[PDB]
Amino acid sequence: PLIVPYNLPLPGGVVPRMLITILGTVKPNANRIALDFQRGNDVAFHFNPRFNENNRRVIVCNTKLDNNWGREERQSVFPFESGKPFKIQVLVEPDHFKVAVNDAHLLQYNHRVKKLNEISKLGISGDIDLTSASYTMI
Ligand SMILES: COc1cccc(C(=O)N[C@@H]2[C@@H](O)[C@H](O[C@@H]3O[C@H](CO)[C@H](O)[C@H](O)[C@H]3O)[C@@H](CO)O[C@H]2NC(C)=O)c1
């Protein structure tokens, strides 16, 4: 068990073929989960499942530059469930982050922050018990 919020260093930033894997369990009365890939204070890629946004479940993705959020990208496919174990895998490709949950492809997020080598930490937060967070090169 890792304490949330958890910061996972990404030494030398991200690069294509890097695979980040997060294993956890959603708390039974969850409101949100967030993964934040950071370039100093900027958030290159925010991945944010919301369990009760006006009584709908939605995943919101965005980028924060100079303390300002950008244009949201929303996905209504929602593979998380309160109480239940999950696996999130984020594969860095040359033009996007590719996200799979529980082994099924979920979404892609085009790189808006293009200095991939400067995206040097991942913060993991929200209503989860965190079991493991790791990376490897495929
Ligand atoms: C496209 O259809 C819909 C449906 C329901 C809500 C929204 C929406 O745009 N919500 C964002 C919210 O998603 C946004 O919340 C922020 O959204 C960020 C990601 O964009 C991040 O998760 C922040 O932590 C969170 O506070 C707040 C504050 O920036 O602004 C809100 N926007 C407005 C206009 O109030 C859109």
Looking at the CA of residue 74, tell me the nearest atom of ligand 1.
1
| Amino acid at residue number 96 | H
Strand-pair partners of 24:
86, 130
Q: Is 108 exposed, middle or buried (0-12, 13-18, 19+ CB in 10 A)?
A: middle
Contact 73, 59 (CB under 8 A): no
**Cβ atoms within 10 Å of 121's Cβ, excluding its own:** 15
Contact 26, 33 (CB under 8 A): yes
**What region, left, alpha or beta, does residue 17 occupy, with left being phi > 0 and alpha being psi -120 to 50 degrees?**
left
Q: Is 44 exposed, middle or buried (0-12, 13-18, 19+ CB in 10 A)?
A: buried
Query: CATH no. for residue 7?
Result: 2.60.120.200
| Amino acid at residue number 46 | H
Task: Compute the distance between CA of residue 63 and CA of residue 43 in angstroms, rounded to an integer.
Answer: 5
Range of the domain at 21: 1-138
Tally of structural domains, the chain: 1
Ligand 1 contact, 125 CB (< 6 A): no
Ligand 1 contact, 23 CB (< 6 A): no
Experimental technique, in short, is X-ray
Task: Compute the distance between CA of residue 88 and CA of residue 36 in angstroms, rounded to an integer.
Answer: 13
**Cβ atoms within 10 Å of 12's Cβ, excluding its own:** 12
To one decimal place, what's the resolution in Å?
A: 1.9
